[PDB]
Amino acid sequence: TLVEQILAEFQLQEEDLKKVMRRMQKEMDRGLRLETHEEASVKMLPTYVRSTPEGSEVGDFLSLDLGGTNFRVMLVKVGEGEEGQWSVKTKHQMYSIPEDAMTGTAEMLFDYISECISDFLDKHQMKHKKLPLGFTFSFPVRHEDIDKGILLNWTKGFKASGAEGNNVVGLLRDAIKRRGDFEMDVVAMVNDTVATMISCYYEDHQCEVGMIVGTGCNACYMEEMQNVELVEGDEGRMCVNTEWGAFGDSGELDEFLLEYDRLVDESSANPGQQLYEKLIGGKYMGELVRLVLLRLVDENLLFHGEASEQLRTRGAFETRFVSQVESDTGDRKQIYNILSTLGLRPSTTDCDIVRRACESVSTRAAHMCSAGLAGVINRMRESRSEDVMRITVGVDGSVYKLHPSFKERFHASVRRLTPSCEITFIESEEGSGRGAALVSAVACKKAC
Ligand SMILES: Cc1csc(Nc2ncccc2OCc2ccccc2)n1
Numbered sequence: 025t026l027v028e029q030i031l032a033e034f035q036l037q038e039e040d041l042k043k044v045m046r047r048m049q050k051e052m053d054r055g056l057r058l059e060t061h062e063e064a065s066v067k068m069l070p071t072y073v074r075s076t077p078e079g080s081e082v083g084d085f086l087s088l089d090l091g092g093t094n095f096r097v098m099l100v101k102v103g104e105g106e107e108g109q110w111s112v113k114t115k116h117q118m119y120s121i122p123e124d125a126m127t128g129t130a131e132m133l134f135d136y137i138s139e140c141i142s143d144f145l146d147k148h149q150m151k152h153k154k155l156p157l158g159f160t161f162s163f164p165v166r167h168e169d170i171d172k173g174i175l176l177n178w179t180k181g182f183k184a185s186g187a188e189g190n191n192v193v194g195l196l197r198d199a200i201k202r203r204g205d206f207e208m209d210v211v212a213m214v215n216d217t218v219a220t221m222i223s224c225y226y227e228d229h230q231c232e233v234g235m236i237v238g239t240g241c242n243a244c245y246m247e248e249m250q251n252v253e254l255v256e257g258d259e260g261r262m263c264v265n266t267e268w269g270a271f272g273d274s275g276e277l278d279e280f281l282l283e284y285d286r287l288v289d290e291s292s293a294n295p296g297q298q299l300y301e302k303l304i305g306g307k308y309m310g311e312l313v314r315l316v317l318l319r320l321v322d323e324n325l326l327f328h329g330e331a332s333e334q335l336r337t338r339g340a341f342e343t344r345f346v347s348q349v350e351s352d353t354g355d356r357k358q359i360y361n362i363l364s365t366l367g368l369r370p371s372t373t374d375c376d377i378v379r380r381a382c383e384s385v386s387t388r389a390a391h392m393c394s395a396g397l398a399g400v401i402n403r404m405r406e407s408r409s410e411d412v413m414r415i416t417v418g419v420d421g422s423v424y425k426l427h428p429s430f431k432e433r434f435h436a437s438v439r440r441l442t443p444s445c446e447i448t449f450i451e452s453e454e455g456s457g458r459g460a461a462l463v464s465a466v467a468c469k470k471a472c
């Protein structure tokens with residue numbers, strides 16, 4: 025119980041989740057009104073992807089995806105069926121992000137990006153062509169239009185100087201020119217939440233919410249145009265990027281933050297920001313575990329009180345270990361190897377404690393996240409003359425997909441919070457690429 029006392033600190037009662045759900049809703053409304061949208065912590069950014077688009081433009085599209093740990097380029101083909109349009113990656117390539125590209129300037133960053141875009145073009149002989157280009161850019165962006173928007177501020181640990189405040193699309197072009205090598209008509213720029221949602225629409229027309237639970241955590245949904253005061257118009261709906269990871273940046277989660285959350289924040293690339301996200305995102309889950317474990321050793325309750333050289337370095341405990349650890353079948357071999365690589369020699373109980381620590385952190389994350397999704401869905405519910413509102417959520421992200429239990433804990437908790445709601449979850453198969461192309465294919469029947 026001495027360990028169960030420390031770990032019990034991560035528990036959240038149904039009432040605590042509802043409070044969180046109700047609070048996220050209050051912030052979503054604030055970010056949407058002209059009078060508070062400026063100091064609102066949940067930005068609720070208009071994305072410009074609209075309810076009923078004019079018509080697609082079949083053909084091959086080039087799609088970029090920047091925001092993960094691996095910048096990606098891919099060719100996707102858009103066609104047309106009864107449903108709507110279809111899409112499919114046909115060629116793809118991943119490129120590791122250098123240290124010199126992350127510390128320098130956005131200039132150098134997009135230059136490196138420019139290269140990868142060309143290297144991809146060589147290998148697949150197509151540099152001579154100029155196709156529409158969809159840009160899935162995973163950061164908060166204030167759009168002026170589907171193909172224009174400024175970077176409000178990096179998240180998840182990106183530093184590139186002189187990037188904030190400027191046009192992302194522009195900078196992308198300002199680099200394609202410093203090449204001449206090729207030409208690309210950068211038609212659309214979208215958030216990964218949105219791309220994921222869009223990619224599932226053609227499969228399920230009821231899909232009006234996109235959610236990402238990976239290195240970061242965020243969501244997007246279809247809002248009634250008249251509620252999007254920041255954008256002229258009251259007819260139809262517009263997708264809105266909630267950027268809910270910034271939830272709590274105004275002190276809305278202070279009564280729930282633990283000493284570990286404070287430490288993780290104090291040592292992050294963006295102290296004081298993306299707090300809600302730092303409770304769920306895989307960029308932090310492992311680190312949350314490392315801090316929990318370390319406390320356990322300093323209270324002489326784990327590893328005899330001796331922490332490895334690696335167990336004491338930041339980021340040493342990767343989020344993928346949390347997953348693996350929670351997959352151990354009971355024979356502890358998985359848990360033992362993980363810790364062994366970390367320079368520890370755990371006992372049977374040491375392994376069961378580490379196991380319990382992970383379940384506590386990932387379970388908190390699954391529940392906290394469930395509060396946000398419920399917040400989004402209940403808000404949408406408050407605009408629908410139906411008994412049972414059926415809605416589909418397009419989802420993507422390592423944590424949500426690869427963590428052995430997150431998915432179930434999360435679903436159960438979301439359903440408890442959403443009465444009269446029939447939620448359906450679909451996982452996106454290549455949601456970014458296919459998502460950008462599908463959007464670009466609609467903005468293209470306007471710019472081409
Ligand atoms: C301005 C703009 C660019 S792309 C788009 N709309 C759509 N693009 C792709 C697929 C579907 C689109 O709208 C239909 C829709 C989307 C989400 C939820 C319901 C319907 N609008």
Ligand SMILES: OC[C@H]1O[C@H](O)[C@H](O)[C@@H](O)[C@@H]1O
Nearest residue numbers: 162163164179236240242269
């Ligand atoms: O990639 C998942 C999410 O990570 C962070 O929250 C980014 O700010 C957000 O834009 C993105 O959608």
